[model samples]
Target chain A: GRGKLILIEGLDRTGKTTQCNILYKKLQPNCKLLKFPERSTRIGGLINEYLTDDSFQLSDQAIHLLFSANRWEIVDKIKKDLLEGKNIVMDRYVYSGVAYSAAKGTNGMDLDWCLQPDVGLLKPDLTLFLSTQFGDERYETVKFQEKVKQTFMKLLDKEIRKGDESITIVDVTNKGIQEVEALIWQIVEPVLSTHIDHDKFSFF
Target chain B: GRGKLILIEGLDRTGKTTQCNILYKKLQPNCKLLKFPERSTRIGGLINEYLTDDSFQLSDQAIHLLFSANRWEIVDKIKKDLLEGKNIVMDRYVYSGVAYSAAKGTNGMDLDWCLQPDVGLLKPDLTLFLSTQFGDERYETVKFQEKVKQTFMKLLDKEIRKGDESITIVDVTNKGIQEVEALIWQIVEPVLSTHIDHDKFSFF
Candidate 1:
């Protein structure tokens, strides 16, 4: 049996990072934790500059591709780790890449273009979307993020229509961290109970 | 009539840069000169580091996306300028982006994958490939670039098969800059003679 590829996804204040950390800790020594805008890499360095610096500029399309490319920088590690029996926990990924960029409604930065750069990355076995989409950073405004949330929700429903059993909506709007963690496990445990340790990998 | 988009593509040391400059200067008043990795861009800064700095590391997939994004960063300008009746002369573009990356022959970096990122970019009205393929930079080398040249040649023939009238091989193999410039003009002049100043644009 192979390890489960779990992703805790959401916008800035959704507590996905805290949940992701807890999930990784419980999964033990073999599990690896990953984050997007994995800002340590050379590509990510540029992404970080774009995200945080007001003066730095990239075209909407170019910035969107950089965000996707940031994920690609770690893809080989992700695939290798998953196959080596590690349960991979990710804080953000393709969904975030797509939703945030697509929400901008910029010309040529449409849904299709946003998703194209990350086309071949691995799809997670379990996707936990914390109830959300905000930030003091580039995509942080409440008004703008309202659109970002709608984008994610739309994709969620669309995926469900296609029978994507891996995705679930977890509402963590006001609950405590432990309360949310418990909710996450309640969803994750059932999926794990089936003991999906198979060698097959699913791709996005 | 719309302006014709002229792009000079080739590996390093092939004088595309020099010719692009000559062509731009000659076409000036209404034209703009562009180059890729359009190194002045924020995305291109990272590209330059990857190309020139030995310590800088980026995954091949990530770097390839960066190159494509470099083009994407300027797509709007390219579109705007052409529609405004300004001809665009480029030192390199999607062809270089695809050929250079696809030539790597790394796992998962096939021609199709290489071509996907630049899918909707504006196609050049006249594409002059300088007979080429080196540098102190990353993609420079005789052995490796031989493969890159083959990749371009394969694409060239494929485009020609589809009646890609804009593409022509400029044999700069043993010519002076003036001589090669003459060849470039010889090819470009005919396309310009009929004058493609029509307000239409073509996309890749």
Candidate 2:
């Protein structure tokens, strides 16, 4: 038996980090929590510099690939934890990579291009997208966040997700943090109890 | 009256350049033949380097945008020619851009990304895709050509092309040049003789 890979995804200030932490505590010793950029690996260091330093100049395409590579850097450990029957809870993954990059709406970097680098990466068994108010981050403006939100929804479209994965949108726009956490548990409990065959790997 | 925007598109060695020239001669002074990378503009020079010089390092995303920008550089002229009632018979345009890039199977640069940059550019009134044997270009391998061919058809799929534009595939897989030429004329003559509204612009 393999433990599930549960991803909590959404826009900035969507309580993804808080929910992911609460879920991790609920799952406790049997689970590991992973957040991306990862920000710890060699590749992630560049991603960190790019995000934190306004002076860091990298093409959107270059940064996009680097972010995906950051995920690849930690994929082995993620797989190992799952095989050990320890569930992995992630704050963000491919969805954020695609949504954020595609939101830039660069000439050729559409949603498909954003998703290209992440193909063949491990997909989550259940993706919980927390919809909430916009934050004050660099990309948190209403106009940009709207595009990112659209791209996220587009990726989760029925035709696009027809094959193997599932995405559930949880609206936490006006809800308290604890309320949102409880709602997430209601959606996550069934997936946590069920078993996914180790041989099957869902793809992005 | 506005002249037609006629595009002859296909994979490498499919006789696109030869056919475009032949068609140009048939249409004579009233028609213009344009091919891409266009290979002359600043962006096109970069695209040329990317294509011909193996050491020219550029990301697929960067090159894809460059190719589209090359088209943009000459778009004003393309529109001007049409408005002046001189039909434009192009060797390649957006389709090739999409198919070729999509075929690379690069992470994230799918047909959609490839198509994004060319959107809002003038659409061809009629597009003729020449299907023939693979050439010896870098992307001319059978496997890669097959992918390009599939992407071409996918673009031509009715669901994808649901609008006023039209694409006709002329099978030259085993046909002689003259025979293919005649077959193309049959498709071209009708559109050439017909009238297209100058007020409307076709999409990618």
Candidate 3:
């Protein structure tokens, strides 16, 4: 038997990380919580420096690849844990990567390009996107966030809905932390109870 | 009284450029031939240098934007010509820009990111993709071409088909130049004869 792969996706300051932490606690025993741009590995360190340092100059394309590379470094462990019947809860994955990058609106870096690198990475069985008010990060401008929102919707409509994965859009606008946590749990409980085959893995 | 916008798209050595030239000559006087990476504008010159010089130090993200900027430089002229009832035949457009960049399998430059810069650009009324034998260029390898082909199909299926634009895939695998040209004419003639509203512009 294998455990389910769950992903919590959303813009920054959307309470996504908080909900993901809460879910991790609830699913404790053998569960792992992973956030993208993991910021721990060598590649992730580059990503972290790029994100936090305004002077750490790298092309958006380079930083983008670095982020995916950061994920690749941990993917083996992720696969192993799932095989050992340990559920994995991801705070962010391909969706945020695509959304944030595509929001830049650079030429030739459309949704498709943003999605190519992570194509063979493991797919989440249940994806919960926490849609809430925007935050004050570098990409948190109203106009940029709107573009990111459109990109997210486009990917959701074209990729997720048309594919085998499950996605639920949870609007947390004006909602409290416990309220949003309750909503996410309701969406996640069913997948957690179902039995998943260890041999089968869904790639992005 | 507006003229039509037609595009001829495909992989390198697919005879796409030849057909575009032929279409331009046939529709001359009020018709113009436009190729992407126009390689004539300042930004395009940089793109040209990057393509021909291996030592060129631009990032894929930067080059991609340069290509779109090249197109942006001439877009006003295109709009003006169309309004004046002058047809424009483009050798490549957003599709090729996306395909080539996405084919690089570069991280974060997925089709969506590739498509971002050209979002508000005018969309072609008709797009003809010449599917032919692969060439021996840098991006002409069998495996990479396969990736590019799949990307094209995915974009066609998800983005183009679902939208209001028209796209036709022509198989020229074993066809001669004249044969492919004739096939293109059959698909294009009717559109040329039809009427289009000058005031309306299609956005990518």
Candidate 4:
């Protein structure tokens, strides 16, 4: 509650990174930017290899958790910084991890199963679910991304019904970066101001 | 092989980091040390958050792959460096990722299941399976750790019988840092000198 946890969730090549950067720049001194599958750490190095090289050979499940752990590993600093009055503009978070992995053809490991580990973790205060109408990116042709998108909608609804505030859905199809950024900032600014006095932070 | 790909495998908090430094010093200018869960990249930021804070949730499967992906991310650099005549020392590698998740008692997710993602990746030229006969002050309880140790042995044997070279077991039971360092150095020196030609590097 110290600052907003603004997550931009989307499939690959949907300009999540661009939006994150624009928001980060807009937020300026009050924001911190983070992206998943950080390639600098030892684990991240492996994740990078997996994404860039198809022959690297990792099981679907193995790579899935690696992505999840990548995010968990840095949750503390992110929360700490947020509590210190800095907003976090994340390109991808738990949702992407779930959607991507669940899209893989694995039984008994649907979206819910993929999401279980992330339950009770910090819920994003403002989630901007970005979707594009068209694109053929790697892993984008799984034929189940639409289902993954449905799961994300369900996830957001669950959080909202539970009384969590500030979740929004954005259709990024054919929208320019500046337009999306403006739309996001309008929603985020009010919440940031309203919650400005809360010195507390929540992980779950 | 230009120089040995020496891996230090064990459960978390087994002093893998400390021993890696010790080994690095013993081998001096000829050796390089890398640890799993690198935590230095953007993806590592997330993995660090997941491990330290229980509230920072990621799915079990997601966390596992992130750990593996974290390995996959850096694998190429490590492989390239090792084949370049540098004795690469690793704190943890594929073994830790497989063993930790496989111990989770999940259905249809055994050690082999965990290892599937890493098949055909670089096999360590030398793996030092570090074990403490008793507790060493971390999550590793002696009995549970013994199982992990046995798993490590089995993993090594499984890989070696299938033709992996230079797998060594170092029992750290009641041994000091210096003693362990010396023991590892003795095993490493001969292999590095004899197996690697001064001017040639090979890829595997």
Q: How many backbone clashes does candidate 3 have?
A: 19
Q: Candidate 2 or 4, higher DockQ? A: 4
Give the clashing residue pairs of candidate 2, or none: A113-B108, A116-B107, A116-B108
| Model 1 agreement with the true structure over B1-204: per-residue lDDT tens digits | 677789898877888888889998998798899888888877788889899986786789889999988998888888888778887898888888888888888877887788878987889998989994236888787888888899999988788999888888877888999999888898887776565646566788
- Ranked by DockQ, the better of candidates 3 and 4 is 4
Native A-B interface contacts kept, per candidate: 0.73, 0.00, 0.00, 0.29
Task: Kindly give the stretch of ten consecutive residues in candidate 2 chain B with the minimal lDDT sum.
Answer: B132-141
- TM-score of the second chain, each candidate in turn, equals 0.94, 0.92, 0.92, 0.83
Question: B1-204, model 3: which lDDT tens digit per residue?
Answer: 699999988877788888888888889798988988687654456566677766655456546655665566677778888999999999889898888887787766788877765666788888998886433234657787878888887777676557655798899999988999899999899888888877777778
* DockQ, all models: 0.65, 0.03, 0.03, 0.14
Candidate 2 error regions (>4 Å)? A1-204, B133-137, B158-165
**Candidate 1 local lDDT, residue B118:** 90
lDDT of 1 at A62: 80
Candidate 1 wrongly placed segments (more than 4 Å):
A132-135, A190-199, B83-85, B132-135, B193-199
lDDT of 4: 0.70
lDDT of candidate 4 over B136-174, digit per residue (tens): 323246566666666676666787797666677678888
Docking class of 1: medium
Model 2: per-residue Cα lDDT over B45-162, one tens digit each: 6567667667765556556656665676677788889988999988888888887888788766777756765665788888888876434235657888788888788877742467
